[PDB]
Amino acid sequence: SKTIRSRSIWDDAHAMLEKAKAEGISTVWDRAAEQTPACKFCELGTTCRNCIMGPCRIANRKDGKMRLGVCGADADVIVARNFGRFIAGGAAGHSDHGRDLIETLEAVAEGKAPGYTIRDVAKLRRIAAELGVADAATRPAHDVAADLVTICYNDFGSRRNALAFLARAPQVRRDLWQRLGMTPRGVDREIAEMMHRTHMGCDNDHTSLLVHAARTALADGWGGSMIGTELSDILFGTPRPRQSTVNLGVLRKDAVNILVHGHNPVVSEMILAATREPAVRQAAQDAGAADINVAGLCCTGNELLMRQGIPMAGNHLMTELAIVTGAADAIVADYQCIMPSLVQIAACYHTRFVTTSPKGRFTGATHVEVHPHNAQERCREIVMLAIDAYTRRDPARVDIPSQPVSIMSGFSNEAILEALGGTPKPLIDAVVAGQIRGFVGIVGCNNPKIRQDSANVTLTRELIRRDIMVLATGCVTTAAGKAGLLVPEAASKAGEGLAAVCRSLGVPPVLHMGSCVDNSRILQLCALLATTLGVDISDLPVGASSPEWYSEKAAAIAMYAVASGIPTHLGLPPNILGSENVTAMALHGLQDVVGAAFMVEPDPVKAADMLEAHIVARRARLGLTS
């Protein structure tokens, strides 16, 4: 229908929306329509439920009533506190993610994690040395891992003046954060401090609240997320370029299909390993299947793509539709971004919905809890449940639409530097020559308010045509992949300068740099280029964009990008427009404080113009043309 066509740009999404219609299954778009119009105070941010003197709403009434909350707080404070707690929730998602990796590395170092290993010993020794572990180059690997675990845990404590990985940022940027009171000190400490500041009668100054929101977000980007990324590479391997495929057509009628969903590779890597064990494969063959087929959703999907080349079935708004194919024999979830509607949709089929984390509980799910000491045994058990469920698939309701689209994944910073010959000199040369005018990270989600992937795809296409290389993470990965942008032959979609550089290196014009925690790789790349050139991150020809964001996590990434000096575009506004002062600080005031600001623009072509304009202005201050 016209409604279905308006919900997504993709053929596979349309086919499943028609099928969900015929089967009477409601989707995220139907619930979004039920929640429109939204509450006007909630959307503006001018409501507070932080104590039971309230709840309070701030209105503009002719009688002048409801200008203040019961405690006396005005719209500036109420909006800034709501936004601070919103950012803290996003930082906490990445923080707990990093913490789980520390605990997994510790279990490996203690010999208490069967099936887990140090997959990248060289990176372990390099990271440990960088952070100050003595004799990291020569001591037994597990001893070095134990000392690296201690350093990472200290960043989740309360005794540091600055996070360990902050040393990567250029000195000028660290000096600025120190003057501003933005230096992140402890990953959990800043989240806790934000929750204290936002209690009634604590922080009642919108500027101070926004400064701490920046500090809390920096504790994610340079702490929780960066620890998460670097330890994931140590446990599961540093990504290198590899071929794979994307879209609902990666599911196979002839195989047992297991979709992995959520964020943490500690689970999805062990599910993949279980499906490769000979006795498990034989059980699938006895059931009538040709093979076992693992396919990724969302960030845990990105993790398996980066390190194992596992095909990705879809991003956020495809998740329900992947079930509607009728071919999902099990969905294995850990935590974050897993819509609870998936439990009810899975119950419309034979599909098993399996939870694995004590943090990600879903009423009605089959819970098989996974920890380092038992993952090998439990993941074997979960794959066996998938195989059993396959025997009851209803073949009449199977509709796998579309043929999969080829992609190239695996662009860690290590992989980029290797393609360049071991130094950033050829990339710097390309930027100085104007062949590559700048870089934009396009990150984040889908949102049913925006036709799915329409802005993600349009923005990526516009930027590469203007010789701006795109670094893609998170759910943008699937959009760029389905648009044919993630392969070396996509150099033909870029402008003449970027196409030539890509062809000379053999890489695509859009580089998949990983999951949402892997936005930390973009910070590390920026820091390296700034330190190499002797400038600040706020001087580099860079930008960031989340055209279709929805999550608290995406807002935390955008805040840490801005506070690190990267101009950051959002397709939709956070719930802050009820305060002109908070809004003006996010869109304009921060520009002169931290060197960058937020932009809000729902037209992806106009967003391309704004990101390009910031890049051009930064090129001028480096003394470059174009």
Dig out the tokens for 590 from the structure. 């921060």
Q: Is 62 in the site for a copy of itself (CB under 8 A)?
A: no
Dig out the tokens for 110 from the structure. 């203690």
**Binding partner selected for residue 327 from ligand FES, ligand SF4, a copy of itself, none, CB under the kind-specific 5 to 8 Å limit:** none
* Distance from C-alpha of 174 to C-alpha of 120, rounded to nearest angstrom: 30
Q: Which of residues 51-70 bind ligand FES (CB under 6 A)?
A: 57
| Nearer residue to Cl ion within complex by CB, 19 or 242 | 242
Q: Which of residues 319-358 bind Mg ion (CB under 5 A)?
A: 358
Q: Is 474 in the site for Fe ion (CB under 5 A)?
A: yes
Q: Is 78 in the site for ligand SF4 (CB under 6 A)?
A: yes
Q: Contacting ligand FES (CB under 6 A), which of 3, 23, 42, 418? A: 42
Tell me: is residue 39 an annotated ligand-binding position: yes
**Binding partner selected for residue 48 from Cl ion, ligand FES, ligand SF4, none, CB under the kind-specific 5 to 8 Å limit:** ligand SF4
Evaluate whether 271 touches 387 at the Cβ level (below 8 Å).
Answer: no
* Closest separation in Å from C-beta 407 to Fe ion: 17
Q: Contacting ligand SF4 (CB under 6 A), which of 4, 66, 71, 368? A: 71
Q: Is 41 in the site for ligand FES (CB under 6 A)?
A: yes
Bridge partners of 245, per DSSP, are: 406
Q: Which of residues 168-187 bind Mg ion (CB under 5 A)?
A: 181
Q: Which of residues 585-614 bind Cl ion (CB under 5 A)?
A: 595, 614
* Closest separation in Å from C-beta 589 to a copy of itself: 14
CA distances for 120 relative to 99, 145, 263, 559, angstroms: 19, 11, 21, 31
Q: Is 288 in the site for Mg ion (CB under 5 A)?
A: no
**Binding partner selected for residue 516 from ligand SF4, Fe ion, ligand FES, none, CB under the kind-specific 5 to 8 Å limit:** Fe ion
Q: Contacting a copy of itself (CB under 8 A), which of 24, 159, 161, 422? A: 159
Q: Contacting ligand FES (CB under 6 A), which of 47, 82, 412, 551? A: 47
| DSSP codes joined into one string, 424-470 | SHHHHHHHHTTSS-EEEEE-----TTS-BTHHHHHHHHHHHHTTEEE
Q: Contacting a copy of itself (CB under 8 A), which of 183, 198, 435, 477? A: 198
Helix (H, G, I), strand (E, B) or coil at 155: helix
| Nearer residue to Mg ion within complex by CB, 276 or 367 | 367
User: Does the N-terminal peptide bond of residue 404 adopt cis geometry, omega within 30 degrees of 0?
Assistant: no
Tell me: is residue 47 an annotated ligand-binding position: yes
Q: Which of residues 84-113 bind a copy of itself (CB under 8 A)?
A: 85-86, 88-93, 95-96, 99, 102
Tell me the angle at which helices 75-109 and 206-219 cross, rounded to the nearest 10 degrees.
20
Tell me: is residue 152 an annotated ligand-binding position: no
**Terminal alpha carbon distance of the chain:** 45
Helix (H, G, I), strand (E, B) or coil at 144: helix
Dig out the tokens for 248 from the structure. 């609902």
Dig out the tokens for 86 from the structure. 């919103």
Dig out the tokens for 242 from the structure. 């590899």
* Closest separation in Å from C-beta 57 to ligand FES: 5
Tell me: is residue 261 an annotated ligand-binding position: no
Helix (H, G, I), strand (E, B) or coil at 610: helix
| Nearer residue to ligand FES within complex by CB, 42 or 605 | 42
| DSSP codes joined into one string, 67-115 | SS-TTS--HHHHHHHHHHHHHHHHHHHHHHHHHHHHHHHHHHHTT--TT
Evaluate whether 183 touches 53 at the Cβ level (below 8 Å).
Answer: no
Binding residues for [4Fe-4S] cluster: 39, 48, 51, 56, 71
Cite the annotated binding site for Fe(3+) by residue number.
516
- Interaction site with Mg ion (CB under 5 A): 181, 358
